[model samples]
Target: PNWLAYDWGLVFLVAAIVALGFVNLGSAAPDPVLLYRQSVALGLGLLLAFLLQFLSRRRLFGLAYPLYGASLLLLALVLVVGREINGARAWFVLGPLQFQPLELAKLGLLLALAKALEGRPIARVWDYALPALLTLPVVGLLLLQPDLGGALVVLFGVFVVVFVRGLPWRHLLVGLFALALLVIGSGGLFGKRHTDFVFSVWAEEWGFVGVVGLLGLYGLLLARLFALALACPRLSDRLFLSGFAGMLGFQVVVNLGVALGMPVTGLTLPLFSYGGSSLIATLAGLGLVLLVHRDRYQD
Candidate 1:
């Protein structure tokens, strides 16, 4: 066991966010089971995070594409067989439990993108072309579901990988232009389980002071991730951690933008939102973060 090398600071930081999320949810909702079920989600997410801390990077990378392929199949399959909520066919529900494949797709994209760009540095003009191509299919499928949040996560998420890999000057200009289109052309397409426009609820329930503290917590999380990514020794590990930072930061900004009366692009507020699949996906990804930190010394 890699006990001494573990990142307790990161773990404690996430626990604080999760704690505040539970408290935030309790105040916003009267449904007793909402908290109860969320506690269960925390527990389930913890279990996965726990297991992944010990899973080697080799194994994680090895399973990347198969997991991605499986997720793509789910994205397509969910459209036909999955249940519809708010007119988006994105969930598969069973009694007390509901699963969203978009969450799975996000993780799959992270792993596959990291593996694809593991040692492949960006030198050639054509080098950057194929990776963006890899992300297009996922974005297209998410749009079919009309899940604006997932699509944005996938699109911007791709940038972090290539960004860390370091691309050409013209490549970046085109990249910025594309995201501008998304920011402008995109509007509300989707979570109110949204207790959905999450930030406003926090503002309403906690007031300005609480919002500051909550935002501060998020600021700390992002700062910590970026600091870690910047100082990380390995390229692949750096890419993976940056993906976490980018995805969470993008969702937080967009989710909060909608809360502040932006175009209502419904996105979850990471540790704070209400969804089992989201909690699971986020914690699972955090687990990978912990794995990278834990394994940081071995290399």
Candidate 2:
């Protein structure tokens, strides 16, 4: 029950994000289903956060590899039998529930990276290679699903882990350059027409001031999480928390970019997006980080 004294600052930011989501969902006007579903998802997500507070670091670390394995299996299974939605075979539809394996994969990849890099020296390029290699399978699987947004989130999270673990600057630069090249070469990565449409709708609906305010909120949330990660005492906890921050940060950027007519990756703003899987998964990830922070403070 000690962990119940959660970070009030972080909680406020999350609540603000969800409140903005309700505004956006309500802007749609007639469709109460979107609002209703999002409300339910938010409720369930908070329940999950409450439950995860009871988890211990040792149990989480022990479950890391197995969770990663399970995620991989689900990713593979989705490709073979998953229902196609929006041109990607990325979801499994069961009656009223649709599950996205990519969401769970993001958390699994973060856990595995934290477990792999714990107490490991990161003095050379090769030192970084192990984490890169550890990440490649998940990246490969996501790419196969053709979920560029998800793949980018996973890659960015891994990059955050490596950066916090003290990767050399030269290696970081090289990796960034390669990533830039990959983005440029991949024609499917940018959805200009879709971006234009979304941007037009957003402009019409919320205006310039609303746009800026939303982005500012996102930035503040990210900066706060990064600060918490910096203050964390345990390396493993810091790594995982940074990864969570990166995942959330990148999703916000890409999703907003898409809405602003930049690219076409199916990323939704964290609490603002009207989807069950994304909302629940993001809350679960945040809960994991909160639990880590709580455990560290208790120690």
Candidate 3:
């Protein structure tokens, strides 16, 4: 199949979702600077998506570990010399731009996991250890930055990868139990003010119909990605797509949960939120997913 003739449902879905974000921003009448910055980020994200289509899967797999290591270094560096905003030292200010390494860390971790699980079988408890080992340190780093939302996102992404790879049901049950305990134990860390505000905004501005519409859109996106993952012929590509789908799906749920007065994590809605770091990171990640899909069709 010609690359240009490739099915582009996912691409069109992302573009439409992002366009909705801009519309929401316009309706909110936010600071002109915020709108301007998001616009620039969106443009850059689209360019990145276009460029990433040409990246070789072999090259990406080869660079996975190195990129993961680099992300770890950046996360560590940010903890030491990074600027703190809202009490989290997760951003490195470059002149006028605030860059978050956590976003890059996510992609790096996903790619590394894809490489690790490419041809490996998960028939034993020990098989689970490597992926966990790769993930825990990054989660620890995010927690050190006190970015619980970011940590959860990483953990959730890893879970999706392992689950799709046929992790033992017992292990999954135990993991969820521990996760529940941790969230309950950390209740004090989450305040209700921000969550309340988000809920109020959604109720006052968009109401129930709008909220349902947003959810439907998210559901459609996930369904499409999930189908693509299953359709992928290669184990590596399937794992990569599954992980990306899990990551994006989790983000949408968590962010919307926060908006509706559920959790108080600082996660923003992907593409729909007004942050450059998240929007660009999400777009770049999806770009890679598209590239994998392209590979599947070409094969």
Candidate 4:
């Protein structure tokens, strides 16, 4: 690529988050072995993200369906042969490595959602039906894993994209409120992960001032992402970038809520959490954002 036109702002923003992730996890877990494992995961994630930079949006559009299909198939496969931890059967454990298809599914859903919504007006019933058709299977499968937190994140991500794509606030309110009621009732089911209460751990370590600083950093990050979304010349790129920013913001809000002694919803703090697959998925998604920004004029 066009090195001169590249988005170093976005790159440095992500790099800062990743750096803080390493620092936070070091204190949160304090296991040298775990730290080494996280480093390996970070390397792989950055490498995967690096490779994706070479991809054009045309190529990504072509692969959207297959990528989504593969993620969905893996989603199904995990229910049978995957390892279970904390009553959620959602990972594949293969000798010193654990991979979660949920992360991949989130990436796939965003891609497929963008492809489907691109250049398509939401005028007919089928236009609205298409998103639910694509998202429900994945959401239902996560529910099968009894992963209430992850499923909600997926659903909320889709809702944000479709909402921005022009779904009415009347529908959003009723649907979101219904979800809120259900989530409040089942909040106890999501208290298993050590990182679930990450905000507490963070506050305990860094106190109130640092918590404010963390929020300030996230505010900057979200503003940066939103600016990129608005800068996209195409509606399609805007949709996907908006989805990415929406999901990231939603997770941060929910994760912080869980940490503040709210009902346990098990949402991890994007890069700041203690998981390999999640950090990988997030960084890979950012790679797509950078690609969009890179081709802002070209597209």
Candidate 5:
């Protein structure tokens, strides 16, 4: 590795941001010992970042699928037997250390998505949907852990990839509409009972049932398509059905966030999150991105 190839600017920026987080956490916690631990975590993250920079991008890409699969298994294990922290059951306790699988899962899934979409033309919704599904289990498990912030990051990452892949404007518009409806309905669903009752009345009057209603409608559409295909198959029908299924799947995941009572806004941004592991994981992701860009330039 050409040590000079490292992006010092980017590295410094990450370090500065983390240092600021330490200062802020210290202000809130007021513990010198805890502050020292934070510093150690920062050093560990930097060490990992430096180590990753020595590896080739192809090596990382080659490992993407295995990493993703391992991450999924870790998440599943966490679901069944992981430690509970605060109100979230998202970590695995090893000896005295608690580790969050979702952190590794996020990075694994992102790398997997990048590899899957590398040379593919994600021109259609289904194209993006298929690869996006690769990351769903991790996202779903995080939601099950009830970590709303982590789930939101996963959602945001998936959408960013889709947008980069060039989803059509009309499809994008429809997606936005569904999102707006889901948000409004979820607010109602998680809101007070009286508020939900009033919103439910309004929803029925407007012919827009809440999240459950939307999901049911989505299912009905799926059933209708399957029945029609079995009865009399056609290419147009198949295409239409595929598109509808993709949209429906997207809505279902969005609704899961609401149903699980995941907060729409609580977690900090990637590098700014509350754990050393989170900082380390996020910096590792950034390092991967840099390495990929470097490889692209060489290519």
Candidate 6:
């Protein structure tokens, strides 16, 4: 069979989405200048995607870890000297340029997670934990910047990588249940004092609520371990179930957070967020996937 020719159809699809994103962001921003800048970023992103299509997947995989490590260092530096944007200190300023290290760090984390599972059979739930744990520190640092949006994206990217590796169903349900409890506990049910107070006060008074919330989280994690034990011989099934559950749980909490008046920001979903820089970075990643993975006849 001939090697797959460049997929113009996919490129057009991405362009259409990016165009829609610009319209949305333009409506959100006070200045029209953001619109012009977004257009330029989108154009550059598409161009980079085209360029990346020429490289082999192996090269991408080889560079993934170092890139991820470098991203971590950048994240650390942002903590020390990054400029404050809006209410959060998440950007790095180098002379004329201001870059969001958290954004680039997401890409590097995505690459590392994908590379970790490249040829391995992540048959069990436990097999996936190491990578997930590795990602936690990166997510933690983003949280320190109080860049909740960026932290969420990091989680999204890693989940995508894990889901593609082979995650399951029942595991998803248990995770969903646990996350529901935390949402309830944090927003409305952390005893009489927690429910009565404002977010700032609630976050502080009964900091034990945060502690309890974490305990509830640990319980969900332990549940996954138990599921893995029962499904030992059937590794792929366990991975699928646990991964699915974790993703659903995350979705529930994210939506709930928004509903509960947690300050929310507009950002892209994996393969779909619209900033020019973000779009370019994502498509480049897809190009890497296409080069490395063999597409089946049925696929």
lDDT of each: 0.75, 0.75, 0.76, 0.78, 0.55, 0.52
Candidate 4: minimum summed lDDT over ten consecutive residues — where?
Answer: 184-193
Give the per-residue lDDT of model 3 (tens digit) for 1-299: 23464448887788888887777766554567768888888888888878887786777778889999999999889999988878989998988687898888888998898888876655566576788788877888987987877787788888888888866435644654465345412121112134233334444467556667767878889999999999988887788888888878887777666554554666787877667878888899888787777778543
lDDT of 1: 0.75
| TM-score of every candidate | 0.88, 0.87, 0.87, 0.90, 0.64, 0.59
Of 3 and 6, the candidate ranking higher by lDDT? 3
* Candidate 2 per-residue lDDT over residues 1-299, each given as its tens digit: 45265677888898898887776666534275657877888888999988988888778878888999899899989999988877779999998887899887888888887877886654566675777677778878887877777887887888888888876435544654465345412121122134233334444566666667778888988988998888777787788888999889888777666654554667766887667778888888888877776677654
Tens-digit lDDT track of model 1 for 141-196: 88787777777777777777777776533554465446435641122111125536
Candidate 1: deviation at residue 28, Å? 0.9
Comparing 1 and 3 on lDDT, the stronger one: 3
Instruction: Identify the leading candidate in terms of TM-score.
Output: 4
lDDT (C-alpha) at residue 152 in model 4: 71
Stretches of candidate 3 exceeding 4 Å from the true structure: 122-125, 169-203, 297-299
Better of 1 and 4 by TM-score: 4
lDDT of 3 at 3: 49
Expressed as tens digits, the lDDT of each residue in 203-257 for candidate 5 is 3333333435544544554454344323323222222223323333443455355
Q: Which residue ranges in model 5 land beyond 4 Å of their true spot?
A: 121-125, 168-266, 269-273
The number of residue pairs in model 2 that clash at the backbone is 1
For candidate 4, what's the RMSD?
5.4
lDDT of 6 by residue, 146-249 (tens): 77656654565455446546544244344434433432344543333121122323334335554355335434433543343234333332332333334334
